Write a protein that binds this DNA or RNA. Structure first.
Ligand SMILES: [K+]
Ligand SMILES: [K+]
Ligand SMILES: [K+]
Ligand SMILES: [Mn+2]
Ligand SMILES: [Mn+2]
Ligand SMILES: [Mn+2]
Ligand SMILES: [Mn+2]
Ligand SMILES: [Mn+2]
Length: 136
RNA sequence: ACAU
DNA sequence: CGATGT
């Protein structure tokens, strides 16, 4: 309904899907970039969206912030809720890095707690999420 | 269909 | 146009 401006917004960016994956988190209110992940040579949009949320959870917990996280990815929000990233990406030598990061993110979710609300950014009403890469 |  | 997902 109304945007919660006191929040963290996260998003993936990619070159190809599967392709080079990165992500970032921004202050929804100002657009200040708060974190950015070094590009990963092969991954999927959804793996990156998932990593971005989990990193946001870890970022906010470390700073004792109760702000919610916005994501535009229905898939990744569900994967975080389930603590399980149900990616179809083949596990092979060239996808090993992204899969290691995904497996490590799931592992962190399974050994830590948080109350952070993870909210759907309503692109149809509000435009692109503030962490978007501007590539579409 | 919806979400990327 | 095509790929990732529920
Ligand atoms: K979008
Ligand atoms: K984009
Ligand atoms: K589809
Ligand atoms: Mn997105
Ligand atoms: Mn796993
Ligand atoms: Mn985007
Ligand atoms: Mn376009
Ligand atoms: Mn397009």
């Amino acid at each position: 309904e109304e945007i919660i401006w006191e929040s963290l917004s996260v998003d993936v960016g990619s070159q190809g899907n599967p392709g080079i994956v990165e992500y970032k988190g921004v202050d929804t209110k100002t657009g200040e970039v708060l974190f950015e992940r070094e590009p990963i040579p092969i991954g999927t949009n959804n793996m990156g969206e998932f990593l971005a949320i989990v990193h946001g959870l870890r970022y906010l917990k470390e700073r004792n912030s109760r702000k919610p996280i916005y994501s535009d990815s229905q898939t990744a929000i569900k994967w975080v809720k389930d603590k399980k990233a149900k990616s179809t990406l083949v596990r092979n030598e060239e996808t090993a890095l992204i899969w290691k990061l995904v497996d490590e993110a799931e592992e962190w979710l399974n050994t830590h707690t948080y109350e952070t609300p993870i909210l759907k950014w309503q692109t149809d009403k509000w435009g692109e999420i503030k962490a978007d890469y501007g590539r579409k």
